[PDB]
Amino acid sequence: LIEPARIEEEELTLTILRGGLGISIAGGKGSTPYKGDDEGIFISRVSEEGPAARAGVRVGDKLLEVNGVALQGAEHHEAVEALRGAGTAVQMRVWRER
């Protein structure tokens, strides 16, 4: 008896179609961190069966990129303005760990 094959970490490109997106982001450079000392932007809440939950967004995902804007080592307002437009779709690369 043994542990199965499991994904330790990954980088996901996800497409979210939407009045809101269904996420709450937390953290950023200059804000109280979300996990450990990593000051990245993370997904802290996913609306139940919202457009982001249908996209596969998971709680704790780190925002690496939004609509081509690299949000690595970015400030909180930098990711909010990159996600507040969201006319109809947002494409974000995320870092998932376990």
Partner: peptide, 7 residues
């Protein structure tokens, strides 16, 4: 409380 923003 640690700076969450709803979207």
């Amino acid at each position: 409380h640690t700076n969450e923003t709803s979207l």
